[PDB]
Amino acid sequence: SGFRKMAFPSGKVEGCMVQVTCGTTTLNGLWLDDVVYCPRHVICTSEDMLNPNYEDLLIRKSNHNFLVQAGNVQLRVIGHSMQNCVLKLKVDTANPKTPKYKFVRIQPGQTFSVLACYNGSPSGVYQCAMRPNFTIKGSFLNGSCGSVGFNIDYDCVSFCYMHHMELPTGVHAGTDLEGNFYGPFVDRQTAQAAGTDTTITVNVLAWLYAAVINGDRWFLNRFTTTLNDFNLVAMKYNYEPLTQDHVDILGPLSAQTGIAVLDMCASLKELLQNGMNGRTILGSALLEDEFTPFDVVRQCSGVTFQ
Amino acid sequence: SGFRKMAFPSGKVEGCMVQVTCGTTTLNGLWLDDVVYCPRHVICTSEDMLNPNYEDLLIRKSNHNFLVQAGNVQLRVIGHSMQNCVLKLKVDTANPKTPKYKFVRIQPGQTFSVLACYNGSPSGVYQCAMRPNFTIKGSFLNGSCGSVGFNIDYDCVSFCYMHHMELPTGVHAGTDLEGNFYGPFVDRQTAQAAGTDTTITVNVLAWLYAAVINGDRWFLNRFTTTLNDFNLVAMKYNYEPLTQDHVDILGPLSAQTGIAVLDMCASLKELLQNGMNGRTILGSALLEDEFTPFDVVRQCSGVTFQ
Ligand SMILES: CCc1ccc(Cc2ccc3c(c2)[C@]2(OC3)O[C@H](CO)[C@@H](O)[C@H](O)[C@@H]2O)cc1
Ligand SMILES: CCc1ccc(Cc2ccc3c(c2)[C@]2(OC3)O[C@H](CO)[C@@H](O)[C@H](O)[C@@H]2O)cc1
Ligand SMILES: [Cl-]
Ligand SMILES: [Cl-]
């Protein structure tokens, strides 16, 4: 036992990272089959970003202007095109390391792993979640744009995110692999502010289920509640309303533990009202919301990937 | 910016994981060059573990009894030998994926990443630290024995840990790659209890330096202290005494931030005495001690690995 914020093994995605340089800008790209995906702002300069017209900035570029390096070998670019906020560079070699993969657009509250990269070289891996206000709370220095978020199922990598920018508040915005941003964010430097960072209540309960499975049970109480009562409390603490679909996704953890979902909501409610009183749950002194119900089951079941 | 508990990319180690079965027991092994390392308790049954005599249990084994599978291909075992608590199985093929690597025995307070594996297949990766009482607080289900902890420098993997067992308290014990356990723990089921889980003060300050670099500065105050005063406080809160070598390792973060190490200790001191008052630092409501000073510099500098 033990429960930890665990990322997916990163090897399969490490094999797709490449460096992309246009003019003076270098960032990362993702090499899948014979196509290299990267943020389109690689073609921008520093003022270019105040109010760029990418359609016009790309007119000045040709295939030979995009220097793509995979490890120490240069890749040949035979085509380029813009799709939403991403450029797709067609190279003349298929990546030999391409895993089986899919492109998916995730929902707020879902989690995924990030392989932070600089200059096409991996730096580290950590788990993140798509926040209800559509930002992620990552770790990104300059040059990390183009690093991707992903989940792995069996032997299929589902890419879900590509990094594009940092708000003045230090949180992060990006796109899916079709180039569409999560949320209202745009790839220009402007007054962009994030909405409320509401907590993903269904992940919190999942994590409370994890704790009981992993021996922490002090928060369990003699009470129960209803969805309509619970939700008055979640609305007061800036929590996502809990829904019947969520109660349903929590069924399996409820079955394995024998603790009814609504009794667990009653545990969460008292914790919101009274705090933890200086105690801890799974090593944390605050309620954790970046573990989905699939993530607790997966980690508590030892699911592996081939 | 942003600061997160980041693991090392796991691809290089994913290429060394293999399944090891002796009789009915399956666990993981590490395939480096032509040798496969795994816990010696793979040769034990269930009662065998109360007070095993591995010397005698191994006398009953031969090379053909150790079934080593790498992905879907079986490996041929041409030799086996015990070194402390690990068995070394010599196979007739060198692993083609062997990275450059080293075996190191770490010091308490040092951190490393774990690639949790089941049946020779990776499941996830997370960062851990060797605790002052020589246990690690991991995530391990049955079948995870043999998963390794590691750090990567440049393109050299320094293996530092191999998982072997769980104490009744849910914390974990293991060995280095030479087969010697960290701490007093032995590979038998007995009354083994962990000593105090003291906090690694030099990592805490490192993380306080990370927070200031990442915009959290509310804990900074108008005070300073001395090592001898500070240490009276660390001793009262079950913190490791801070030493001059530690002040020295913190120099670079002190230089980059302009906050004197002893002023930062004065910040840590008030936090120990008054608590955080319901606020948070780098997203945590408690003081984090599993980031070493090298880990903050590395993550805040974008160091990558080839
Ligand atoms: C085969 C051995 C094994 C596997 C997994 C676990 C841990 C575990 C954690 C979390 C969940 C579950 C199991 C699970 O879903 C939520 O529990 C449901 C009700 O018992 C069950 O119907 C599901 O098939 C599923 O096992 C223990 C032992
Ligand atoms: C080249 C661009 C760059 C690199 C790294 C960073 C972040 C950074 C974080 C943490 C530390 C340091 C830097 C560092 O050690 C601790 O700061 C010391 C005093 O300035 C310096 O002497 C060291 O070389 C080292 O830069 C910013 C910009
Ligand atoms: Cl916390
Ligand atoms: Cl974490």
Numbering used by the authors:
A (entry chain AA), B (entry chain AA): 1 to 306
What does the publication say?
The viral open reading frames are expressed as two overlapping large polyproteins which must be separated into functional subunits for replication and transcription activity. This proteolytic cleavage is primarily accomplished by the main protease (Mpro), also known as 3C-like protease 3CLpro or nsp5. Mpro cleaves the viral polyprotein pp1ab at 11 distinct sites. Mpro possesses a chymotrypsin-like fold appended with a C-terminal helical domain and harbors a catalytic dyad comprised of Cys145 and His41 in its active site, which is formed by four major pockets that are labeled according to their position relative to the scissile bond of the substrate. The active site is located in a cleft between the two N-terminal domains of the three-domain structure of the monomer, whereas the C-terminal helical domain is involved in regulation and dimerization of the enzyme.
Five compounds of our x-ray screen bind in a hydrophobic pocket in the C-terminal dimerization domain, located close to the oxyanion hole in pocket S1 of the substrate binding site. Central to the first allosteric binding site is a hydrophobic pocket formed by Ile213, Leu253, Gln256, Val297, and Cys300 within the C-terminal dimerization domain. Pelitinib, ifenprodil, RS-102895, PD-168568, and tofogliflozin all exploit this site by inserting an aromatic moiety into this pocket. The first allosteric site (dimerization domain) is in the direct vicinity of the S1 pocket of the adjacent monomer within the native dimer.
